[PDB]
């Protein structure tokens, strides 16, 4: 699944499971809510609640 994910001014290039996980935490810090880390990444909302207890 190589796949480019844009969020303002940065892009993430995603490889993998293991990159979604560390793009939830980027955006989470960034103050994103569950809901747009969801959207973002093209998951669930209880996928993104898991990768943020990590």
Avoid: C, F, P, W
Avoid at 36 to 49: C, D, F, T
């Amino acid at each position: 699944m190589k796949k480019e994910i844009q969020v303002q001014g940065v892009r993430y290039y995603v490889e993998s499971e293991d990159d979604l996980v560390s793009v939830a935490h980027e955006l989470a810090k960034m103050g994103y809510t569950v809901q747009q880390i969801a959207n973002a990444l093209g998951v669930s909302e209880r996928k993104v609640r898991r990768y943020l207890e990590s």
